[PDB]
């Protein structure tokens, strides 16, 4: 209930909310039914439009009017965006040439650059060179200042999950916005784009910009806007605002449009009738630049126009239906469309199985458009997991398509033609962003990058520092033309151990045997070198990995790979090869298929044994350092030593060795040489980071031998494929993986074919970034290479698509 019979009299558009039941004059008022009784009178004027006309150019002020035209306006900062223009010769901001602004040029009273965000719906990424004639304003913005080819969302790629971690640096899994409608079990809510729900606090987490800004000190804009405001009312009271007297003026603004993914849905993205949308919200941005042109603010204000999702072409047509593959339909509740969650109907209920309705769900048609997941075998690069509002049952469904639980839910609601939401590595999804001010570069291409990103970015614009977030700080230094934050690299906290040679043969009893008593000094005190480290400026190219945790660890070195020990997951944690393009991919001999040999460097304590695997009915064992890939057959021998072994499920050792046999060779051949770092992942929670010991779940039977989720490798070459790997000058180019260690391969509909129909298909889907790898392992890697930090912090983020 609202005392609403106050006044917005001098108040329209204020800043600080004013709290129930006085009345309110904000952007939330409508979404409140809280406005006083003469907010449209006062705060929404319309009279005469939104242009001056030569005739008003000069006009007594009338206060009915929505922009003026008279002379006292540029000092009551109400002006019509094209005053200027129409009644002083002044030419729009688009017609004058670009020119560099190298340092801020602000009026008086400026403390810093304002910074506004200009956010549009659905813009996809390829709008800007499809629309480029239609977009003047904004292809000056791209072409002057710096932009990127594509800006990757985060999944799901809908609208409240991508602006909530455009506004916090969070992965939507920590912000909590996990899609734009969400079921809480603990609230026993739900969130929806309609209704008064989605207005309470307790969805929202992190820390958002404006909050950001607001306990430092900067004060923010409004960032929400009611959709009942049009766009030229929007404009103007960012234009007013920043008119404010420097005690009360924000430095951060938000400007956001509905479209164009309002018609992108109803005409698909690239429907005739987008030219229209397109054309509009250009003049929008005209509108924005002229009004800062004559309040003295082009070469002052940083301007951020950012996407938050693509757009791709969908149809009813192109529906599946939960009701052809299940039975039980209406024992579930489907969070439906481009993606699915599916949970019980009832949770009275001990008998719903989420294990037959994946099965239901797998591999059932040959033409299947989704494929299920618990959510913990998602890809790990989709971040998209450790939240309780996220259902256990996953169905990341192929661009195109739509899944349903039943027919008559898409005709008891064809309407549409685009949506959005899938996998944020999908083309059609990918969305834009320009920079332009005297902080951003000018002129300037930057490599496609991740809106988690921004957050960071947007501090640094400010002045501020950034809460705790998903960015890597310093990965967009290269965006800016000055930089207030100089990144460093972690301390390494635990240093290794260097161990010789120090237990005899008979002191191990692993139940382990190999043919290897098969017996010269030229090559005697050559093994010799190698054991201690002659080889490693081959193999380790780019410094030890530094671990960032407490532990007890080995250096092993070794002819041909060096790795990282840990005598508490008695694995390695890193190993590391390099393969030249020349190398030769070689067999395990026959006499050597079931060799594993006792390390003398590491005590029968901390070492694996074969016993447990032999009981371990379903539990086998892999090699990190691929034996296929030995230099010679003497060092051959050191890839089967108990300590290069881990744990692999039957299942999975299809899918390593096809890697290890086949890939990496390829790669090698294709990239002038790789280095490659394998190694386990321990993430039995599903958190994204590395599990300390008391978390693991599952065990090689009857040993301490922990068994991995996942296993990872980093693979790394020169950027210019003329040099080999092992001597490159310049720049690196990576791509990485994250395996789930399954015991099955029922995510591969083709599995039961030759792995060289379905393997790579895996591990593409499975592609990562170095950053996701060293959240899930404590390492940091890349820590000695004659690159700036910069410059490899934008490696470690980067992610290899695979997209055309
Ligand atoms: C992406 O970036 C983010 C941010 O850096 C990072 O997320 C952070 O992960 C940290 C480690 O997991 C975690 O640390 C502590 O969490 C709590 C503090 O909780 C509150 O306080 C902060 C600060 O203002 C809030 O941000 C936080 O918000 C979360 O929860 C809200 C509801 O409370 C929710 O609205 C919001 O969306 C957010 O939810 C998310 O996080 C929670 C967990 O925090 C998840 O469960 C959700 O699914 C969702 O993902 C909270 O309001 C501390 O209390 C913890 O302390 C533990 O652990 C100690 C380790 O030093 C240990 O020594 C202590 O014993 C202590 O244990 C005690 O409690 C145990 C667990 O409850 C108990 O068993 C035990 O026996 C004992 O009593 C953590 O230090 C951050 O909160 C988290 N922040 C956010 C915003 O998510 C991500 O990890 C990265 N992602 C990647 C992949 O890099
Ligand atoms: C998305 N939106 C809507 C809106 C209302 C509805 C209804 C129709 O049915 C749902 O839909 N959209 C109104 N104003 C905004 C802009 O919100 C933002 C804009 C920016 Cl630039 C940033 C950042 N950084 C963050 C936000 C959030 C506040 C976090 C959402
Ligand atoms: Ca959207
Ligand atoms: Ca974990
Ligand atoms: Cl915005
Ligand atoms: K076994
Ligand atoms: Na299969």
């Known amino acids: 209930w609202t005392a609403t019979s106050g006044s917005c009299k001098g108040r329209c558009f204020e800043l600080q909310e004013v709290g129930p039941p006085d009345c309110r004059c904000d952007n939330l008022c409508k979404s409140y ?10 705060c929404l004027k319309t009279a005469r439009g939104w242009e001056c006309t030569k005739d008003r150019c000069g006009e007594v002020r009338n206060e009915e009017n929505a922009c003026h035209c008279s002379e006292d306006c540029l000092s009551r900062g109400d002006c019509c965006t094209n005053y200027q223009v129409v009644c002083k010769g002044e030419s729009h901001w688009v017609d004058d040439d670009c020119e560099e602004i190298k340092v801020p040029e602000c009026p008086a009273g400026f403390v810093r650059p304002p910074l506004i965000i200009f956010s549009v719906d659905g813009f ?9 004639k239609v977009m003047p304003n904004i292809e000056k913005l791209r072409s002057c200042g710096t932009h990127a080819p594509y800006m990757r969302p985060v999944y799901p790629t809908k609208t409240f999950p991508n602006l909530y971690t455009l506004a916090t640096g969070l992965y939507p899994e920590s912000h909590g916005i996990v899609g734009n409608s969400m079921y809480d079990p603990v609230f026993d809510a739900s969130f929806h784009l309609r209704g008064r729900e989605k207005f309470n606090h307790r969805w929202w987490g992190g820390q958002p910009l404006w909050i950001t800004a607001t306990k430092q000190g900067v004060r923010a804009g409004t960032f929400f806007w009611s959709v009942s405001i049009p766009h030229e009312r929007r404009i103007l009271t960012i234009l007013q605002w920043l008119s404010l007297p420097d005690n009360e003026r924000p430095s951060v603004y938000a400007f956001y449009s509905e479209q164009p993914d309002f018609s992108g849905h109803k005409y698909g ?15 929008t941005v005209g509108q924005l630049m002229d009004g800062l042109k004559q309040l003295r603010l082009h070469r002052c204000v940083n301007v951020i126009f950012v996407g938050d999702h693509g757009m791709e072409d969908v149809t009813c047509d192109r529906t599946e239906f939960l009701s052809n593959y299940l039975t039980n339909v209406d024992d579930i509740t489907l969070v439906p469309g481009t993606l699915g969650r599916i949970r019980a109907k009832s949770i009275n209920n001990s008998k719903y199985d989420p294990k037959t309705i994946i099965a239901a769900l797998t591999c059932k048609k040959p033409d299947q458009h989704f494929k299920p997941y618990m959510k913990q075998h998602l890809p790990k690069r989709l971040h998209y997991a450790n939240n309780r509002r996220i259902e256990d049952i ?3 469904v192929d661009r195109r398509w739509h899944v349903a639980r039943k027919p008559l839910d898409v005709y008891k609601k064809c309407f549409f033609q685009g949506d959005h939401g899938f996998d944020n590595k999908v083309n059609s999804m990918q969305t834009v962003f320009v920079g332009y001010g005297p902080t951003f570069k000018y002129r300037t291409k930057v490599p496609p990058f991740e809106n988690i990103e921004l957050y960071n970015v947007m501090c640094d614009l400010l002045g501020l520092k950034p809460a705790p977030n998903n960015g890597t700080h310093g990965s967009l230094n290269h965006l800016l033309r000055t930089n207030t934050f100089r990144p460093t690299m972690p301390d390494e906290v635990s240093r290794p151990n260097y161990p010789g040679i120090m237990y005899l043969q008979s002191e191990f009893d ?14 005697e005190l050559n093994k010799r070198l190698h054991t201690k480290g002659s080889t490693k400026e081959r193999h380790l190219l780019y410094g030890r990995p530094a671990v960032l945790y407490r532990t007890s660890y080995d250096i092993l070195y070794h002819t041909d790979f060096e790795s990282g020990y840990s005598e508490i997951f008695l694995m390695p944690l890193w190993t590391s090869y390099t393969i030249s393009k020349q190398a030769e991919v070689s067999s395990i001999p026959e006499h050597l298929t079931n060799c594993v040999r006792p390390d003398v ?7 694996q044994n074969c016993l447990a695997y032999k009981n371990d009915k379903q539990m086998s064992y892999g090699f990190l350092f691929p034996p296929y890939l030995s230099s010679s057959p003497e060092a051959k021998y050191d890839a089967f030593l108990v300590t290069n072994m881990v744990p692999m499920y039957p299942a999975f050792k299809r899918v390593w060795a096809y890697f290890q046999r086949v890939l990496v060779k390829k790669y090698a051949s294709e990239r002038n040489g790789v280095n490659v770092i394998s190694g386990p992942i321990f993430d039995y929670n599903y958190d994204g980071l590395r599990d300390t010991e008391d978390e693991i779940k599952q065990y090689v039977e009857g040993s301490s031998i922990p068994v991995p989720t996942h296993y990872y490798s980093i693979i790394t070459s020169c950027l210019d494929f003329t040099q080999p790997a092992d001597k490159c000058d310049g720049p690196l180019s990576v791509s990485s993986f994250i395996l789930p260690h399954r015991p099955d391969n029922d995510e591969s509909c083709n599995s039961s074919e030759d792995e060289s129909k379905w393997v790579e298909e895996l591990m593409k889907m499975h592609t990562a970034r170095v950053r996701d790898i060293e959240h899930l392992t404590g390492l940091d890697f890349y820590r000695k290479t004659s690159r700036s930090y910069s410059e490899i912090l934008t490696l470690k983020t980067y992610l290899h698509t695979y997209e055309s």
């Open 124 to 132: 996809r990424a390829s709008y800007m060179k499809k629309g480029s």
């Open 33 to 42: 039914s809280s406005c006083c009784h003469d907010f449209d009178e006062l």
């Open 510 to 523: 692993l139940g382990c045997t190999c043919d290897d008593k098969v017996e010269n000094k030229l090559e």
């Open 269 to 283: 993205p690239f429907g005739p009738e987008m030219t229209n949308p397109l054309r509009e919200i250009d003049k």
């Open 601 to 607: 460097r590491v005590s029968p304590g901390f070492s």
């Open 394 to 396: 996953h169905l990341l």
